[PDB]
Amino acid sequence: QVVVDAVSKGAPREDSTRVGRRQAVDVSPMRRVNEAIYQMCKGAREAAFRNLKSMPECLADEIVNASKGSSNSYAIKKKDEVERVAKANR
Amino acid sequence: ALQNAVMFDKETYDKLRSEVPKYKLITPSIISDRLKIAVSIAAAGLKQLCREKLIRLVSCSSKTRVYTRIVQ
Amino acid sequence: AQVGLIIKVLGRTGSRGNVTQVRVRLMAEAGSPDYNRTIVRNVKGPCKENDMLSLMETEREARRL
RNA sequence: GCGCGGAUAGCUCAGUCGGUAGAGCAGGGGAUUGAAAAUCCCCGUGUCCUUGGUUCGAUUCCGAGUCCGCGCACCA
RNA sequence: GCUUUUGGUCGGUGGAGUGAUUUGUUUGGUUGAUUCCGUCAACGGACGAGAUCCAAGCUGCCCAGUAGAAUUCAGAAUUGCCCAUAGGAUAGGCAUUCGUCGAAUUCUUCUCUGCGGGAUUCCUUGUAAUGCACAAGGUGAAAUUUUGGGCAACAGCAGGUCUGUGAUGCUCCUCAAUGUUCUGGGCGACACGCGCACUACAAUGUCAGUGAGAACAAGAAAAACGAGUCGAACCUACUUGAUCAAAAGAGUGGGGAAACCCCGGAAUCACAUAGACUCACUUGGGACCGAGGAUUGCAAUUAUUGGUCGCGCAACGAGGAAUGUCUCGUAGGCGCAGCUCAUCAAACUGUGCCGAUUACGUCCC
Numbered sequence: 073q074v075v076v077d078a079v080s081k082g083a084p085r086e087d088s089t090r091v092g093r094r095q096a097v098d099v100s101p102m103r104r105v106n107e108a109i110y111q112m113c114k115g116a117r118e119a120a121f122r123n124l125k126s127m128p129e130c131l132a133d134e135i136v137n138a139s140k141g142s143s144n145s146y147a148i149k150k151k152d153e154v155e156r157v158a159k160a161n162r
Numbered sequence: 163a164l165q166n167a168v169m170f171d172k173e174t175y176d177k178l179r180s181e182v183p184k185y186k187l188i189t190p191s192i193i194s195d196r197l198k199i200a201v202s203i204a205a206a207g208l209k210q211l212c213r214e215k216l217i218r219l220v221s222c223s224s225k226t227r228v229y230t231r232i233v234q
Numbered sequence: 235a236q237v238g239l240i241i242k243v244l245g246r247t248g249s250r251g252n253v254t255q256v257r258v259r260l261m262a263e264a265g266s267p268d269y270n271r272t273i274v275r276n277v278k279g280p281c282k283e284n285d286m287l288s289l290m291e292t293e294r295e296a297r298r299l
Numbered sequence: 300g301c302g303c304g305g306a307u308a309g310c311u312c313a314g315u316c317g318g319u320a321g322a323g324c325a326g327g328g329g330a331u332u333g334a335a336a337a338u339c340c341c342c343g344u345g346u347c348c349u350u351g352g353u354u355c356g357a358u359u360c361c362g363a364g365u366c367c368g369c370g371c372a373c374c375a
Numbered sequence: 376g377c378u379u380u381u382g383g384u385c386g387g388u389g390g391a392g393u394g395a396u397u398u399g400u401u402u403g404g405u406u407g408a409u410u411c412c413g414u415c416a417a418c419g420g421a422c423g424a425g426a427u428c429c430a431a432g433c434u435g436c437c438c439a440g441u442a443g444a445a446u447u448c449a450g451a452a453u454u455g456c457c458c459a460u461a462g463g464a465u466a467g468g469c470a471u472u473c474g475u476c477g478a479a480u481u482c483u484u485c486u487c488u489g490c491g492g493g494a495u496u497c498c499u500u501g502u503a504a505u506g507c508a509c510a511a512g513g514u515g516a517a518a519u520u521u522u523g524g525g526c527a528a529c530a531g532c533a534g535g536u537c538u539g540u541g542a543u544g545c546u547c548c549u550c551a552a553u554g555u556u557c558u559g560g561g562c563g564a565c566a567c568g569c570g571c572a573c574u575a576c577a578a579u580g581u582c583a584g585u586g587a588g589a590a591c592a593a594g595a596a597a598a599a600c601g602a603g604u605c606g607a608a609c610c611u612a613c614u615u616g617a618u619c620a621a622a623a624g625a626g627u628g629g630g631g632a633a634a635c636c637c638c639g640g641a642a643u644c645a646c647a648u649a650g651a652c653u654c655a656c657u658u659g660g661g662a663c664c665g666a667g668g669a670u671u672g673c674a675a676u677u678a679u680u681g682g683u684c685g686c687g688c689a690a691c692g693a694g695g696a697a698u699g700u701c702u703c704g705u706a707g708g709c710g711c712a713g714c715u716c717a718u719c720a721a722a723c724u725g726u727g728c729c730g731a732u733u734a735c736g737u738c739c740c
């Protein structure tokens with residue numbers, strides 16, 4: 073349940089691409105499951121790259137902090153950066 | 163920098179037997195930066211606490227061993 | 235963020251074809267003002283119809299075709 | 300030597316009237332992108348010209364003084 | 376090889392035009408496809424596409440002392456009271472195990488394979504609106520060129536090859552020959568600039584153990600020298616070397632290769648291994664070179680190659696502008712064979728193993 077709560081919060085609901093200017097575009101529910109899994113495996117991988125911590129700790133920390141919606145997770149820093157850029161590129 | 167000790171001082175081994183059994187989610191990397199000791203000591207210090215039953219072994223593999231406090 | 239349901243996929247849009255033009259029904263709680271409201275919006279990513287998605291600002295509509 | 304203004308990071312500049320600094324802009328990163336300029340998001344960074352009286356606490360209050368502008372002065 | 380991974384080219388006879396030339400060969404839907412349906416001053420044909428061919432997946436018959444299986448008596452092994460130093464998770468009429476180099480007596484489940492089945496948009500209900508067809512699902516081993524390759528027209532390039540040939544025209548050299556053989560060098564030389572790999576920059580790891588466990592494949596000789604028949608050249612198990620390092624060096628078997636290698640003990644991986652390291656240019660990396668030694672060869676110097684101990688204080692901490700390949704048993708990783716080969720693979724041609732992310736779109740470049 074902590075993982076399903078981490079996947080559900082891990083990816084941005086909105087994003088911005090050039091469709092014609094840089095218009096804000098909605099994100100499908102399929103990609104939101106893809107990009108949540110992608111950005112948690114990423115970032116936990118970069119945490120443990122030259123760290124004392126093992127990979128099952130760095131992966132366990134990204135899943136927990138994204139499950140709580142904390143900004144300590146790598147994904148939630150990028151989930152909030154994309155949504156505020158999408159809110160300004162409307 | 164990250165200069166870790168390679169053997170226990172008498173001060174920090176007393177930290178090993180007191181504060182570490184009070185933690186939840188003990189791993190040899192949690193102990194390595196809390197107690198500033200190398201993981202080769204931290205893993206050796208935690209195998210000692212299992213045979214004294216102060217901590218619990220909740221998950222074991224050849225590389226990764228995860229420990230927890232015993233609740234009684 | 236309101237959760238809207240895709241009732242129609244209007245074709246692949248944009249230059250590179252990565253953006254999809256959909257027609258999304260807003261799915262409100264049936265006593266609301268903006269109930270059974272349908273919007274024509276751009277979706278980024280793989281989207282089939284009957285796929286719910288969250289919407290930040292529902293008062294915009296995308297320019298069709 | 301008379302009154303007014305200016306001194307606040309490299310540059311630029313509004314201040315809460317005596318409860319701690321801000322935006323502007325440059326300097327290092329990801330984004331746009333196929334490649335641009337512009338646009339964005341992210342990390343530098345000023346003991347706040349010198350002195351005191353040091354009001355709970357002085358870029359802010361106050362007393363001189365250096366510096367710089369304008370408009371005025373003027374008998375060893 | 377490349378124009379070109381594209382669907383394209385050509386006559387005949389009719390129509391059109393003074394003519395080069397058009398028409399057929401098409402505006403419409405459709406398909407990967409001038410693929411089809413419809414229209415149609417054209418009508419009939421030819422090639423290319425499709426078909427055929429190979430390989431892989433499911434399957435029939437045939438089949439085995441060059442493939443394997445069960446059983447039944449004999450022979451042997453364990454046999455319970457047992458809870459690891461700290462000891463988790465996880466099936467359960469006649470208990471189980473097999474150079475044991477046992478006898479028997481019934482079999483084709485897997486294996487091999489010559490021809491043959493099976494897939495066709497076949498069935499179903501939206502798109503389209505007659506048609507040709509399309510999407511979703513069914514059926515199934517397999518679902519849309521089933522997958523993957525081979526083969527590929529017509530024109531052409533002043534592409535490459537006169538270093539493949541006793542393929543060739545012309546022209547040069549032709550007895551101190553540009554012939555042909557020896558001997559010795561060189562092709563490999565390094566201020567440098569680039570393609571392509573390989574190895575890494577480490578802890579999702581290095582090490583040292585231990586387990587489970589692949590497919591494609593290769594393999595010896597002559598009108599010679601020896602005993603018209605047989606030997607030795609080739610690959611290999613096994614012993615030895617061994618009262619003491621590898622690398623060797625030797626015996627002794629076997630194999631013409633579904634019969635021996637071989638129950639092919641590949642490497643990734645795996646492991647509750649109670650193993651060392653613990654974030655460091657470090658037990659990461661292994662460039663550089665020093666000293667023994669042994670094999671290939673007629674010859675090792677400008678180390679052929681392996682192995683041993685040193686060196687490791689050689690950059691390298693994930694890479695600027697740029698750039699390449701890829702849509703499923705795929706990318707990537709991993710090794711193994713063959714080919715070059717007396718000796719030498721960071722190559723190439725094949726094969727297996729582990730096995731994903733993303734898209735199933737578009738004409739932006």
Ligand SMILES: NC[C@@H]1O[C@H](O[C@H]2[C@@H](O)[C@H](O[C@@H]3[C@@H](O)[C@H](N)C[C@H](N)[C@H]3O[C@H]3O[C@H](CO)[C@@H](O)[C@H](O)[C@H]3N)O[C@@H]2CO)[C@H](N)[C@@H](O)[C@@H]1O
Nearest residue numbers: 379380381382407408424425520522523524527701702705
């Ligand atoms: N002889 C087959 C040829 O296929 C061509 O069409 C081919 C192309 O449309 C297309 O080929 C593309 C190729 O363009 C592109 N450069 C690369 C791409 N991988 C290929 O794709 C094709 O081959 C691979 C098989 O490896 C498959 O992934 C794929 O299913 C298949 N569409 O797919 C077709 C091959 O099936 C032409 N229709 C024609 O030249 C000819 O019929």
Ligand SMILES: [Mg+2]
Nearest residue numbers: 387388389390
């Ligand atoms: Mg004519």
Ligand SMILES: [Mg+2]
Nearest residue numbers: 694695696697
């Ligand atoms: Mg550079």
